[PDB]
């Protein structure tokens, strides 16, 4: 509604303003009275599959697990590597940025001291042991799970992890009822999986879709991630040390170009008029 409730509760409300607010009040109340039934159904469905998850071994001795990376993508970092790996167990001899500096013999409990040691270094990728990778038959092993969260020590055998998992992810169900690229901070403009090519102006342009814009700080870890589509134009090259507040990439959100990576004569080949193409000329430009 365009007319706002200019009044407040200290000054009271008109009859019209009260009637308008009642719409939203009833909407919210009905949504609350309705969607938690679906939330309870979802919790029951979740707890049904995870009945048999009970820790059975301590170490299944499995191979490599899964990679771990922060959430730097999209915009600013939401959750860093500090809390995404707190309580996990590594799978390989993960090493510090200085070569041949190993802190774990393929498995250790990443309690607070190890998190501090890791964040002190410039490590950004750690491979930890996950439940999906566990090789235990008819259950999971304790080391493939990680330390318990209610206690803080390594989880002991016999504890039913599926039920607590389903309950924990079903509890908040009620509460959840409802062209250009600009750099923000100083860093290194890094292009990953880039098919680089030079435009007519001598700058750098892109000819692929599997390329991502990365912001690398002085330490080496990636801070910001951005998406660049195929056939975009970049105002800066690769490996450029620049500060934030600069529009580096420009592309038309509507026009999608077929830019040719090579240079040479362009003669019209295999376009015969009247069968596949039509003769149309611009009425203002003439080109």
């Amino acid at each position: 509604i365009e007319t706002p409730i200019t009044a407040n509760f200290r000054e009271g409300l008109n009859v019209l303003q009260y009637f308008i607010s009642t719409h939203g009040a009833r909407k919210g109340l009905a949504d609350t009275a309705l969607k938690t039934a679906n939330s309870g159904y979802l919790t029951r469905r979740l707890v049904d599959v995870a009945q048999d998850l009970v820790v059975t071994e301590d170490d299944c001795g499995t191979h490599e697990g899964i990679m771990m990376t922060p959430v730097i993508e999209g915009g600013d970092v939401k959750e860093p590597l500090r809390d995404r790996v707190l309580g996990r167990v590594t799978a390989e001899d993960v090493l510090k940025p200085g070569t041949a500096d190993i802190l774990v013999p393929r498995n250790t409990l990443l309690h607070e001291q190890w998190c501090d040691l890791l964040e002190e270094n410039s490590v950004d990728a750690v491979k930890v042991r996950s439940v999906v990778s566990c090789d235990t038959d008819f259950g999971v092993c304790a080391h493939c799970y990680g330390r318990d969260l209610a206690r803080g020590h390594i989880i002991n055998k016999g504890e039913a992890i599926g039920v607590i998992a389903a309950q924990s992810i079903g509890e908040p169900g009620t509460q959840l009822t409802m062209s250009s690229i600009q750099v923000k901070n100083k860093g290194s403009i890094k292009l990953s999986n880039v098919k680089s090519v030079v435009n007519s102006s001598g700058k750098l342009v892109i000819t692929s879709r599997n390329t991502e814009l990365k912001l690398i700080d002085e330490f080496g870890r990636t801070k910001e991630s951005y998406k660049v589509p195929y056939g975009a134009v970049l105002a800066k090259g690769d490996g450029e040390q620049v500060a934030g507040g600069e529009t580096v990439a420009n592309w038309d959100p509507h026009t999608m170009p077929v830019i040719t990576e090579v240079s040479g004569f362009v003669r019209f080949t295999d376009m015969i008029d009247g069968q596949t193409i039509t003769r149309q000329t611009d009425e203002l430009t003439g080109l």
């Binding site: 309870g40 707190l86 309580g87 969260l149 209610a150 309950q167 924990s168 509890e171």
Partner: protein, 250 residues
């Protein structure tokens, strides 16, 4: 079974069995009568339909209704669905040694709950019977029942030490997560409402606006030990979902 007012009550299975065996006897009579084939076919189809309704009423054809114009429930209707034996009688079960009361605020310690004295003698009643027999105060168990019915001073003098070091579970429906069930060490209060420690209200998602509380008393040594070791509110400090604490002052 007979009812108090001289009436009767029965399951619909009696109706379905009567129907199927009536039609089976009629078919048996028809066979030896050398009846025309169309009538015998009609009777066989009627038997098929009757057995079909017995096994699953509203599955093949129209549901057979009783005298109240409601569909008769088959014996497959009462093992399936929300109201069946599996969900209503096997997974979730009515329980003994339990009570309910409104919830009020506590000065209380974190491991204690305020249990009304009027409820305590009822919940633990066999325990008072046994302890009072052991003390030799009443000759027989029926005498002890008389004493607990008179509420003499001795029954309270036995209660205050029966409850001590005997944890008691507290339940607040709906139990969204594992913290909805916790064990507290009872303390006896003159009143009618369950006194709850404010620090656990956040975990219970309970406010003092008329919410109820279900109370359960563990019986065996193993159950009391499990309540003391795993279910005590002192043990539950951090949520199982994630490491942050759950006893934050609200």
């Amino acid at each position: 079974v007979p009812l108090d007012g001289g009436r009767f009550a029965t399951s619909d299975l009696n109706d379905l069995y009567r129907r199927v065996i009536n039609r089976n006897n009629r078919l048996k009579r028809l066979l030896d009568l050398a009846a025309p084939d169309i009538i015998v076919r009609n009777e066989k189809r009627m038997l098929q339909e009757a057995v079909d309704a017995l096994l699953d009423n509203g599955r093949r054809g129209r549901a057979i209704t009783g005298s109240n114009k409601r569909p008769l429930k088959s014996l497959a209707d009462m093992i399936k669905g929300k109201q069946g034996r599996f969900r209503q009688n096997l997974l979730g079960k009515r329980v003994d040694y339990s009570g309910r009361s409104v919830i009020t605020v506590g000065y209380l310690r974190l491991h204690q709950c305020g249990l009304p004295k009027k409820m305590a003698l009822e919940l633990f009643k066999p325990f008072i019977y046994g302890k009072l027999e052991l003390r030799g105060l009443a000759t027989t168990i029926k005498a002890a029942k008389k004493m607990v019915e008179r509420e003499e001073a001795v029954v309270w003098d036995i209660l205050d030490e029966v409850i001590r070091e005997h944890p008691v579970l507290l339940n607040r429906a709906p139990t969204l997560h594992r913290l909805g069930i916790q064990a507290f060490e009872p303390v006896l209060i003159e009143g009618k409402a369950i006194q709850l420690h404010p620090l656990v209200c956040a975990a219970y998602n309970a406010d003092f606006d008329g919410d109820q509380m279900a109370v359960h008393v563990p019986l065996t040594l193993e159950a009391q030990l499990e309540a003391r070791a795993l279910m005590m509110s002192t043990n539950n400090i951090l949520s199982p979902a994630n490491g942050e604490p759950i006893i934050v002052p609200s």
